[PDB]
Amino acid sequence: MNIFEMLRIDEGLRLKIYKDTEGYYEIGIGHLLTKSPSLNAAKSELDKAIGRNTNGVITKDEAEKLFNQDVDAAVRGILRNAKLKPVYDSLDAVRRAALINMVFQMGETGVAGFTNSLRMLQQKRWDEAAVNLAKSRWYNQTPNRAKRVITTFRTGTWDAYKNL
Numbered sequence: 231m232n233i234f235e236m237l238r239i240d241e242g243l244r245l246k247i248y249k250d251t252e253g254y255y256e257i258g259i260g261h262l263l264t265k266s267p268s269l270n271a272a273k274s275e276l277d278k279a280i281g282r283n284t285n286g287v288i289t290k291d292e293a294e295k296l297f298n299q300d301v302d303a304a305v306r307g308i309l310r311n312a313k314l315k316p317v318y319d320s321l322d323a324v325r326r327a328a329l330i331n332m333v334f335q336m337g338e339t340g341v342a343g344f345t346n347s348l349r350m351l352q353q354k355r356w357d358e359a360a361v362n363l364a365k366s367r368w369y370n371q372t373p374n375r376a377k378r379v380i381t382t383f384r385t386g387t388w389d390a391y392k393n394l
């Protein structure tokens with residue numbers, strides 16, 4: 231199991247522009263197109279992202295290029311971030327994947343404000359951090375996903391992903 235497998239699991243795959251649970255415009259494997267309401271807009275973006283006149287639809291290949299690009303970006307993001315880096319560095323491999331999952335999902339900005347859990351993570355207070363993580367808009371908005379991630383942080387294993 232790895233980060234790609236993980237995220238593919240959590241984000242699915244769609245060749246069509248679609249709204250996200252947050253109503254926003256996405257495509258592929260969780261590729262955020264735009265925080266605004268114009269399909270025309272998202273569409274523009276799509277085209278720009280792909281470098282061709284897509285018309286709202288892309289190839290698997292395409293989805294994956296974005297995906298590739300997106301994991302890369304998350305990682306760098308983390309690595310450059312002053313609040314993130316220390317956590318990351320302190321963690322084990324599985325747990326790192328979980329971090330990257332969150333940043334992907336919600337952005338480095340978003341994650342960097344999980345200030346408390348971050349500390350707890352850093353101090354390897356796995357159960358407390360999990361509790362903490364759970365008191366979040368994030369959790370309430372996408373419970374099941376949140377749970378998998380949270381577990382991962384909790385256990386340092388891939389169990390929550392095994393079987394699906």
Ligand SMILES: [Cl-]
Pocket residue numbers: 279
């Ligand atoms: Cl892009």
Ligand SMILES: [Cl-]
Pocket residue numbers: 371372373374375376
């Ligand atoms: Cl969910």
